[PDB]
Structures are given as structure tokens and as C-alpha cells.
Symmetry: C3
Subunit: 237 residues, 3 copies
């Protein structure tokens, strides 16, 4: 709510290193758009979105507002490019979940060593707990094939794979589990390919968002690292 609050969330408790990379990420994004003012949409979709995931990596709650903008726009822009896997995913799943996420995260916040901001309390699945979730996804793959037969189905397999994985990832994330980042690393190497092949069928893609997914991949390694530090801050000792 508070501007004083907004000041904390946005500027509070970044390391130098986190600051450098975020600023450079917005820079490359600014510089790509000061070349292509025409696709202003996808460039907004990157800037809000780079901020979304960098904030998740930090465990900041105000990621969700950014996410809400970002996934919506992206949903449109991924349609205008005939990436149908990404379009139904962002619109139907990510857009409601932004609020759902804000709900359940909101309940589980905490200070962090500078106390200049609030970080979510991160949890760690066990191997057993994990082996279930992996199976869950393979089960619900057959369920994502049954569904979506309706209206026929026009999902190439790979456009398809990146979609199960993305839902499972999103689900661990709202649930505050560190293992989400292992999944995010796979959804990011996959979506980069999606926008890279899209540049051949038909011979086209959008640079702000293909570039966005490269910055996503980097950050998703940061996320895994930082979320580990986070899981310890709230554990056995």
C-alpha cells in the first residue's frame, strides 16, 4: 500500500551484483526498443517480466503486480506470432495465479538480514516428495492430451512439453518451494527454442521476448542459488 512501502519493495536490500545485472537487463531491453519503437508491446512485456522474475528470485512479493502486466501482454504477443502453446498458458493459467500467488505468499513473509525489505519464506521438498511431483507431471501430461483434444489439437510436441513443465513450476513457486528453479531452468531453455524456431515458421520472431527468455535463463540460475540461501534462512540451524 504505502509509498514508503513501495520505496522498500523497489529499492530495498539489493546486493550490488543483483543491481548491476537487473540494470543491464533493462538497458539491453531499452536499447533494443530505441531501435524498434513499433513493437512497443513486446518491449513493455519484457521490461515488466524481467522485473517479475528477478523479484521472484529475490523472493519479493511485488513480483506479482509486474507478473500480471507482463504475462497478459506476452499472451497477446505470443498469439500475434502463432505461438499457441505460450498464449493459452499465460492467459488461462498465469493470469489468475498472479492473485492466487499474492494471496498465499502474502501470508508467509519475513524481514531478511538488512531488514530493508521483506522476503518470502522458502521451503525445500525432499527427494521422495519430489519423485511424486515428477510423476504427477507425467500423469497430467496424458490429462493435457485428453483435454485440448476439444477444438481439435494443434500443439507441436515441444510447444507442448514446455507447457506441462511451466504449470508444475508455477505451482511449486506459489507454494514457496525452492525446487521450482530446477524446473524454470528447463522452461527457459525450451521457450528460447520456441521463439528461435518461430523465426522460421514463418521466418519471423520478436527480439524483445526472445532476448527476454535469455535473460530469464540467467536469472533462473540466480533464483536457484538465492532461493537456496533463502531456504536456509528459515530452517533447522
Amino acid at each position: 500500500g504505502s509509498l514508503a512501502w513501495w520505496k522498500r519493495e523497489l529499492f530495498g536490500g539489493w546486493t550490488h551484483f543483483e543491481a548491476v545485472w537487473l540494470l543491464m537487463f533493462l538497458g539491453i531491453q531499452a536499447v533494443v526498443f530505441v531501435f524498434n519503437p513499433d513493437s512497443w508491446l513486446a518491449s513493455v512485456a519484457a521490461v515488466t517480466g524481467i522485473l517479475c522474475v528477478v523479484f521472484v528470485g529475490k523472493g519479493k512479493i511485488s513480483n506479482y503486480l509486474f507478473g500480471l502486466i507482463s504475462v497478459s501482454l506476452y499472451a497477446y504477443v505470443s498469439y500475434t506470432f502463432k505461438l499457441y502453446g505460450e498464449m493459452m498458458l499465460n492467459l488461462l493459467v498465469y493470469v489468475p495465479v498472479q492473485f492466487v500467488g499474492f494471496a498465499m505468499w502474502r501470508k508467509h513473509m519475513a524481514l531478511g538480514e538488512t531488514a530493508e525489505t521483506e522476503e518470502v519464506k522458502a521451503k525445500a521438498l525432499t527427494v521422495r516428495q519430489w519423485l511424486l511431483v515428477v510423476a504427477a507431471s507425467v500423469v497430467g501430461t496424458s490429462v493435457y492430451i485428453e483435454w485440448l483434444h476439444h477444438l481439435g489439437s494443434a500443439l507441436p510436441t515441444l510447444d507442448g512439453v514446455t507447457v506441462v513443465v511451466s504449470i508444475v513450476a508455477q505451482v511449486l513457486m506459489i507454494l514457496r518451494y525452492r525446487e521450482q528453479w530446477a524446473l524454470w531452468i528447463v522452461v527457459n531453455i525450451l521457450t528460447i527454442s520456441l521463439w528461435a524456431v518461430a523465426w522460421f515458421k514463418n521466418g519471423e520472431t520478436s527480439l524483445p521476448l526472445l532476448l527476454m527468455y535469455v535473460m530469464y535463463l540467467c536469472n533462473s540460475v540466480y533464483g536457484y542459488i538465492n532461493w537456496t540461501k533463502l531456504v536456509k534462512r528459515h530452517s533447522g540451524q
Copy 2:
């Protein structure tokens, strides 16, 4: 062969991390198959094989069975995709090698930290030796070019280079040298490229084996890391 053994070898002394990844790798391989049951053959070549390399990372000697399955199936699958460089690599090189490797590793297994299972004893090349190993690889390339002049060759360079690099890594790996992992990281980047071209000449590549190799690269870093730990543990 002991059953109690295969229990240790297969499930013993994994970190939460290694576990969390090796499972997520197999899951993604599975989700891929629940989409295209059509070529299980490749999906199996991927599943057996992720395990191969994940097990070499660990210094686990049972890596060799998984490899034997993996490389043979792989040799076939790359043959159906006109990657004739790779199919001959697996067939003439890797398939006999699982055996030679198993031979030499077995004499140099050690306990490892939890005593829950055993690891190969890793060694480190020196800068001198490594320079020599690398020098060999260029000298040895003119030999791989003279050979294969015979029986003809549309040896595209990319396919060709990765075949030389792969042979040298394999030799170091059987010989239990850490530095294989450096070479592995490069053969993985090269081979990701082979399957990335295979879908322009022409239009069709295998997904499980494209994915397999992305995962191979991830793991080849863990490999490097983990073998440095192995070198410390055993001298």
C-alpha cells in the same frame, strides 16, 4: 552382480541435489515420450544414457551397463538421421569401449565419504601432460583424415571435429583423468549443434536426443565439479 549391491550402486549416496536433478531429467524425458510414443527407441536411448553420464559424474562403475544400452540404440537412431559421423562413433568406438572401461575402472574403485557406495579413483593431468594430450589430438587428426579417405567421406567438418574430441575424452575417462570433463563440455556443445542442423538438412530431428544432449551439458559441469572432489579424496 550381487542384488544387495545393485541396491547400493543404483540408490546409494546421492546428494539431495544430484537426486533432484537426475530425477527431473528423467521426468522431462518421460513427458517427451507421453507426447510421442512413436519413437520410443530414441526415448529409451535418452533415458539409458542420462543415467550413463550422471553415473560417470558420480564415478559409479555401473555406468557402463547403462552406456552399453545407450550407445548402441543411439548409434542406430543417429543413423536414421543421416548423422553418419555419430553412428560410427558409437558403434565402432563406444560399444567396445564400455567393456574396456569396465575392465580398468574395476581395479581402481574406492570407498567414498558415506561408505554407502564406492567411487572410481580420479586422477589429474599436469599442464605438461595436458599440452601433450592436446598435441596428440591435432597430430592424431591427420590420421583420422587419411583413414576414412578410404570407403569415401562426406565428412562434414562439424561432425568430424566432434568425433576426434569425443575419442580423446573417452580415452581420458577410461583412464580416470578429471580433465575428460573439459573435453566433454565441448563435445556436448558441438553435438547439440549436429542435432540442431539435422532439422535444416532436412526438416527433421529427434527431440529426445536433442534434449538428452542439453542435459548432458548441464551434467558435464557437475561432472567437472565432482571429479575435482574425487581427485582430492584419493590423493
Copy 3:
């Protein structure tokens, strides 16, 4: 300089790791060359240039002559493959800078822990400063869109960004800032997109320079790390 001094410069104060990845970076380049004596030009461009950037990484000064050879041959070669953003960047901007650079670094050398070689004294920007430098990059982009407008521009958006970013990185290098390597990590990822599209239009690319930029990416990460050590040694 002396023959005693050149022994220190080229062989002085390498970690076993840096040494292994260096000799191998050169090995893999040599091999792509034993396959295609066809254009050694790109190969010499690759070899010096790997040496250039590993040398920048180590904070060594004779990176500069290597850079000089590298950026020339390359600037030419990036012309013969019709990559015009890259050719103008290397010739007009880099060849001057190799000189400016040697001038400036020369003032700020220091020894470093083994007392073998001379490392440059690394500094770091603050977040405040970093904010300017990035915002500067944004202004200077529309200002480089003015400049280029005269006599037209066959500048794809991609090529255009990678020239902006590459200059800003090179300004940071000459001024001796650790933060250069974040930029380089982006230009190296961008320049592999460039030589990847160059393959498609028109149906052509050079392996030694596509490899070299993959080896650049690896080394640009090592760069960031070692320059962090390097800032710490010098307050």
C-alpha cells in the same frame, strides 16, 4: 621488452585450470583448422583473439598486440560473410582502441600473488555510476542512429544493439572496470546469434569464428570471476 619479461608475460602466473582451458581452447581451434586449411585466415583470427580475451581475463597487458592481429583479420572476415555491423565495429572502433588501451593500462600494472606476471589494477563501478553508464548507452543509441542515417544503413536491429553494447563494454575495459564482463557476456551471446543467422542468409558461416565466440562466452564468465578477485587484490 626483455626475453626475461616475455617469459613472465606468456607463461607467468596461470592457475592449472586456466592453463587447461587455454591449451584446449587452442587445440579445438587447431583441429577445426586441420580439417579446413581452406581458410586459415579465420583460424589465425580465432587463435589470436582467444589469446586476446583470455589475456584480458588474466589482466595481462600483451593482450593488446594479440587483439590488434585478431580484430583486423576478423574485421576483414566478418566482411566476407556480409556481417556489416561487426566489420565496422572492429575496424573503426577496435583497431584504434588496441592502441588507446595499451597506452592507458600500461600506467596501472601491479604484481599479484605469485610474483610472476603483472596484473592490471581492477576497479569497480558503484550502482549509482552503473545507472549513468547504462542510461548513457540508451541516449548514445539514438545518437548513433543519427550518425548511421547518413549514406543509409543495412543494419539489422540485432547487429545494431551488439555494436552499441560492444563499445560500452570496450570503454569499461579501457577504463579498467570489472563491470565490463557483464556487457561482454551479453555481446558474446549476441555475436553467436549473429554468426548463427549469417549461416542462414546467405547459407554461410565460418566455424572458427562461431567456435571462437562460444569460447569467448566461456571465458567472459571466467573473466567476471577473476576480475572480482582482481578488484579485491587492489583494495
